[PDB]
Fold this protein.
Amino acid sequence: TRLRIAMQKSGRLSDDSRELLARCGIKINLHTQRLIAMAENMPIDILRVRDDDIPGLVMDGVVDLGIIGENVLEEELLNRRAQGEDPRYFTLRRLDFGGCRLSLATPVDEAWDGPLSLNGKRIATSYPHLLKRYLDQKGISFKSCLLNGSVEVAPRAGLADAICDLVSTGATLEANGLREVEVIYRSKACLIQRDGEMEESKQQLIDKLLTRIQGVIQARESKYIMMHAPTERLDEVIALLPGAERPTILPLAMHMVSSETLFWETMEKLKALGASSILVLPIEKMME
Amino acid sequence: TRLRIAMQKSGRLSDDSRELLARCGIKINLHTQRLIAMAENMPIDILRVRDDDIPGLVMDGVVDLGIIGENVLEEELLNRRAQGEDPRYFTLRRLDFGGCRLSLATPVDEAWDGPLSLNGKRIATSYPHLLKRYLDQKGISFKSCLLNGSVEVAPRAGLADAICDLVSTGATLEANGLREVEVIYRSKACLIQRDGEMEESKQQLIDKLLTRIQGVIQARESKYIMMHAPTERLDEVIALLPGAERPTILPLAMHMVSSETLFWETMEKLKALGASSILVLPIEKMME
Amino acid sequence: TRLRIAMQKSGRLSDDSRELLARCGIKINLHTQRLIAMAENMPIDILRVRDDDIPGLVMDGVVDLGIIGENVLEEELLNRRAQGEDPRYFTLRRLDFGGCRLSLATPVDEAWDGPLSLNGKRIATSYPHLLKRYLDQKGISFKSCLLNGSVEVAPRAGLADAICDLVSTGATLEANGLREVEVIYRSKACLIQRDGEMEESKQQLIDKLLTRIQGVIQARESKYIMMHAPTERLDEVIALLPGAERPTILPLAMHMVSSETLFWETMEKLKALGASSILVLPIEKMME
Amino acid sequence: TRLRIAMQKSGRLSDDSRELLARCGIKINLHTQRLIAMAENMPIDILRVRDDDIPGLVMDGVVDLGIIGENVLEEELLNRRAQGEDPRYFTLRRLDFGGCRLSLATPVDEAWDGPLSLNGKRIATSYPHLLKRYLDQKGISFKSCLLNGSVEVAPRAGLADAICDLVSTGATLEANGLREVEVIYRSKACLIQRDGEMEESKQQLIDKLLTRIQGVIQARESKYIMMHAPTERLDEVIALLPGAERPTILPLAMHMVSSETLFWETMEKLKALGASSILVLPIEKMME
Amino acid sequence: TRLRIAMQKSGRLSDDSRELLARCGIKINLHTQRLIAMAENMPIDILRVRDDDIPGLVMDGVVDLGIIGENVLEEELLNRRAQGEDPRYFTLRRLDFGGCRLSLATPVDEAWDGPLSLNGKRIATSYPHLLKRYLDQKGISFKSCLLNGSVEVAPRAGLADAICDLVSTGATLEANGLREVEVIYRSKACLIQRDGEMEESKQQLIDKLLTRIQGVIQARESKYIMMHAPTERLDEVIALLPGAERPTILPLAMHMVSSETLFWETMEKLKALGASSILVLPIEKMME
Amino acid sequence: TRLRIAMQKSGRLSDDSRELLARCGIKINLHTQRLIAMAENMPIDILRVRDDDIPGLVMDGVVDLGIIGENVLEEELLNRRAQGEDPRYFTLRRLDFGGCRLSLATPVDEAWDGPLSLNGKRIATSYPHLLKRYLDQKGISFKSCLLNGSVEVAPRAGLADAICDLVSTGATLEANGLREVEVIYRSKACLIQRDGEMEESKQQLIDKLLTRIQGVIQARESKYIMMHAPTERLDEVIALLPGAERPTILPLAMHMVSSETLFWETMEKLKALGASSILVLPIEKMME
Ligand SMILES: Nc1ncnc2c1ncn2[C@@H]1O[C@H](COP(=O)(O)O)[C@@H](O)[C@H]1O
Ligand SMILES: Nc1ncnc2c1ncn2[C@@H]1O[C@H](COP(=O)(O)O)[C@@H](O)[C@H]1O
Ligand SMILES: Nc1ncnc2c1ncn2[C@@H]1O[C@H](COP(=O)(O)O)[C@@H](O)[C@H]1O
Ligand SMILES: Nc1ncnc2c1ncn2[C@@H]1O[C@H](COP(=O)(O)O)[C@@H](O)[C@H]1O
Ligand SMILES: Nc1ncnc2c1ncn2[C@@H]1O[C@H](COP(=O)(O)O)[C@@H](O)[C@H]1O
Ligand SMILES: Nc1ncnc2c1ncn2[C@@H]1O[C@H](COP(=O)(O)O)[C@@H](O)[C@H]1O
């Protein structure tokens, strides 16, 4: 049939996934209670499902493409491998959204001196396989304690010596007497392809879609920069701005496209280097 | 230590559970991000957790009481039993909230002639163990297809011949080309006790709490009814109103407490039986 | 086929209409985008439509029952009669919700001396037929100015000398330099039957439904009152409480059911008449 | 002119004040941006103002009645008295809403041994006069530190050794490293009259209004109770239920009106005393 | 007096209309309940009215300018013309918002072979005049069925063979057993002038306003594009980018202003044509 | 210790202040109930407090920097000076948000002929010190009437002849029978430093922070403009566009950075001066 892409129906990645495909020129209605939507022009099926189920759909080839976050995907990969299976998939690419970090946390009123210290302790978590891979690699053994939510209760409840959980502002942990202490895994949403052989047409589309994804991401990361021919030191400038597609010089400045962001520190440097009237303009779309 | 009761932190049973204990005279703050709250007077700890984790907490004796819905509890019971374990628990009582029904559903454009018809087919569901117990009992075998959400996609997506899911208004199914066809399990929230021996004091409290629960539930189910001494047929009246604690007769009506509800049909009957000016008054609290 | 009742899909009467039928024991789902819902038990079809269209649906017999407010219904009746037609309908009954009043309003900085004063003036309104019936009856002629909303602009905009509109708090008028000055029509929602002959079964149902409506309305209007045998003046008591179903006397008070409300003024009277410890208890349901 | 009652325009007492007067039979519109509303029937003016300004309006006789919470009123009384003035007012009555408590709080990681311990320390607060009256009475001196909000920062910010603030769930304090330790003042909304002589008519109204207030409050506090003639011990029953208007005895129970609430403990007692089928019914309105 | 512009008080065009005039440099307050607002500087009156009433206000010259959607305007034009009148107006211009499409729809389970097929059938709609103009032109006759909302009930309710309605996501139709089948009219908001002679001053303003409208629309549609002198094929480039105001060439790219949007397809072409690093930058304002 | 910056916890300046520091590269969590937050990298403490308390915190040196609006700051300055104190502070800079204006207002039905007219009258206000400074300077004396909110009641309530209050849309005043008549003070948020000597390190940071503030403000105010070498009149162009950093000329336009905004009037001029295709592009960040 036609192309089948799996995406989270409702949660942390849904708005962003919905948005990418639109931005890639994908007309489709998501204001519907229906879960398997046909795209209004391109021959594309979007299945709105639970994030938890995406890796597997992809690993069983029951869909061709999926948008899912690294942690979930990798957790389920290790799960099957621990059951003896050989799940297979192609990572087409890591995306520019969904960030999150999985971290070790311990009671605030206890000082920390590294992971070895956890040897023999009980750690609660929803990500048993990711935590085990990390400590194993580190030679540390531990007793797992499984919970699917509210993981932060574990310590103040006598369920564990410590926990491993998604953290961001760090609010919950403080409110639950714990503090971050080591990030063991950082994840982003990514785009994955099913295993096996792909037909000419749909693969042509997959290939096509990918490039539009690249452009959408570039455009939001990249910027158009305009300085001032600091003649001499002109060299040192370029090094702080990995343009990757050549500055343009003009007697009277410089005009170039930066893929990365101009953090204050970096501008702070340019300045002291003698650069004047530094400008950054947004780019709405780009094809390079 | 003191009494430990597990309840859903956020979802379908949280408001109602929060409400029962209040109604049972339990001062405690739930407007906090903290997950293990001490009750402001009674020596009680409330752990706000994921519903999915409650059965187990209870079955491992890591808490003493839990409020959780029948389906979730029974699903996890069958899960462990299938792994060879012997999870143990006391059901103190079934509650008056959390209702839901698990049902078989099939594509609307296909006619249905009972469960045998599913023999050999693939059914998708989040409740693999409850579905298997039901069909097994019925002698029907089937191929399971596991999803944790959006279960209704299965058919229109070539993943299954049919699904088994929580249904209520019936909205999703229609929007997903399916129709209900058989209810296989009806669930309500219930109150459960850990296995093992319980100390004097906390058990005294558990015992105490139970009675307050009974009164709160009675009061909302029961009503105060006032009719009119239909002298003769006076008998036939009582039969429609399972009072369970004796009518009261007065020459001039009747005044009694009904545990059940006065549905229209039932009042419709009383009437035709000759009963006049039938009244139903709410009861805010009761101790019987 | 089966019974067909028309109700407003979304607006001022929808919540209340939805509520009545439920209260009358009508299972049906309104959380759906579908507009012609079948009731889950009783053989009933509910068509969710625009209030504006209800009178006509009923007057063309394209449905059997409708819930619609008096003003809208009567406006459309006069509309057709002005076109030469003979729309026909039975009013089964006036309901206990939807109240509103249509009123004449004039610029605040102008003093008012009755309707005759409008003779020859221009009045803006969305209810041209109701306004015309009223002034005609009064012998006053006027120039109509039609608007379907924002009627209050008319004066401060040179479109009319005054307006006729739905008023309630009176907010808009003040904010638009106008003041109420005469109520010409007061409306409530009512229940109407199509013209023609009605089959046995569905009419049986219509007849049945009506009685449940009566009970629901009574119960919310009526109350259970308990005083104190003011022996002598005992007479004067009853007159302030149109019980309509006989007080009950007890030496030791009175116990009776009032259909109307006990306004302060009325209680204020009882009191001064020598009545003590006056009580009013809510009634949740009743069959008389 | 006519009667003038001051009430909070928006905040903690507004909904409840708005509600009382309605419940007292006061038609008036508060869905308006206008701040001095005339009541649609009774000759009453309602001024919607800042709670902070109410005491003074009342103490300057610029309005006749005010609804304001004890803490605010008493704080401003002490303020003026400290400036040398003699603000005067009549408390007509304490209401049944607005509860709150002003309390001393100190850093959690410090143990507490009573108020004397604060002698010589700095305490931050928005209620300098209420705190000073309390410690003065106790012989303790202290250094004040004034803030109008976010008072809980003081300690963790080096601004004070401790704070005195409105507390309820106790959330902020925990999130700010502090714990309650002594309640120094408990407040409720109350109803106050201006100083001076009051005219016949408006005073007649004030007098009238008061009684309706009493009835509204009684009705929500009081309940209708029905037990069972525990013949012998019949005595001991009455003592737990301060009826204040005589039980009613019936051979076959008891039927009476309790002004207070039936807490579990109290019902728990009745029970053990031999009382059976205890009932509590709501009262919607009452005139005693 | 001064200039009078009519706009929808609340609905689909209000936010956008409010926004245009602001963007055109029109200070005025719409956070008010007042319906005829004076603009804080320019001598302009804005009347906030019901969209339904705009065409007519304009056609009766009771205002000078109006913002209203094509369908509504044209429906009312045909309405009057059918009553024998000669409504007159100038279309100053079609705007860049308010899009919508009026379409024929038929039951999903029935296959479609063009409009002739409807000859003799009943079609329900709120736009009787637009539907009639379309089929008349096509030689097809039909029976109209008028509803002002919920038009999608018609078929599943036996009221019509099909419907003609505003469609967008296509949600309602599916939920009501219907599918789109032919778009008969596409509408956008437009700006219209009253008939008759216009004074010097206000016309000067109308003329002025128009140009600012043009600039606001251009700026949001147009973009600044930067490619790379693909020397040879340089020609073929320009054809895909209707610049309308001359590219700019630079040895080292191209820098130009496109009025239209760079759809993927078009960029896809440029690329394959040999164009590199294609950029699109937003334009916030422009005067050409 | 480290740097301490005071900001409003919740109100009119909080979102904007929160935003500036982020924009200045300040990582910190404000989704917390905690009031004294440490910034996740830079050695910075943010105290979330009541705006009313900021001036003083700064004037007592209990924090080093504060973001607070001019009116509040200046009101409290005059307050202390009237008590005999000598509060001291450095204004680092006026910001680009928080605008508001304090104005004299009088009953609509009374005509106005300047401030002298208020001599001897009573004016109500929350800003007694700012109003007094203004009229004093003008030689006018008056009687103050203090209120902390709902100041607009004063006139229609017999409390004052007129009021002085924050005005914006002008809604309240109209709804309270008043009209603006003279703006006496215009305020914006500003950034202030404590009095005294500042250490090397933190001052280094303060100095650093300031420059980032400048860039963030410039970027949002400034724009990138592109015209067309109107050769001759080329001169007259520059005068309308205070570039402050030199246009750039190109035979084929002009390319420059305007610090101010291109209002219509100004573009209207350029145009008539012969300028063509005028463009304005947003600037996201800049370092000059
Ligand atoms: N990025 C995320 N994706 C899924 N869950 C998350 C994510 N971030 C935080 N959570 C959950 O929300 C809480 C952490 O957020 P926070 O309190 O802001 O640090 C923890 O209980 C996490 O389990
Ligand atoms: N009572 C429930 N508890 C948990 N999930 C439910 C419950 N009821 C419905 N759901 C989920 O919500 C949808 C059914 O609701 P409905 O469309 O109203 O019939 C299905 O996808 C169910 O999986
Ligand atoms: N009961 C009602 N039903 C329909 N429209 C109403 C109703 N009441 C008020 N309106 C409209 O809302 C405004 C009146 O409400 P109010 O300002 O509260 O007096 C007027 O513009 C009326 O046209
Ligand atoms: N009843 C109240 N009236 C006015 N302010 C209050 C009241 N209760 C709490 N607050 C403020 O809100 C916070 C306390 O609420 P809580 O965190 O729930 O204990 C404190 O910062 C108080 O200053
Ligand atoms: N653009 C529109 N303007 C006015 N009404 C609309 C518009 N679009 C849709 N509607 C109404 O809303 C429903 C269609 O929206 P949808 O279900 O998203 O396709 C139909 O019932 C239409 O009558
Ligand atoms: N910028 C402001 N900052 C603080 N309070 C304000 C501000 N603007 C208006 N207010 C208050 O809100 C009302 C004025 O807003 P408006 O009715 O839109 O003109 C007055 O009662 C002011 O006291």
In short: The pocket of adenosine monophosphate (ligand 4) is lined by residues D 12, 100, 152, 165-172 (CB under 6 Å). Chain C touches chain E through 27 residues (CB under 8 Å). DSSP finds nine helices and 15 strands in chain C. The domain at 98-187 of chain C is CATH 3.40.190.10 (D-Maltodextrin-Binding Protein; domain 2).
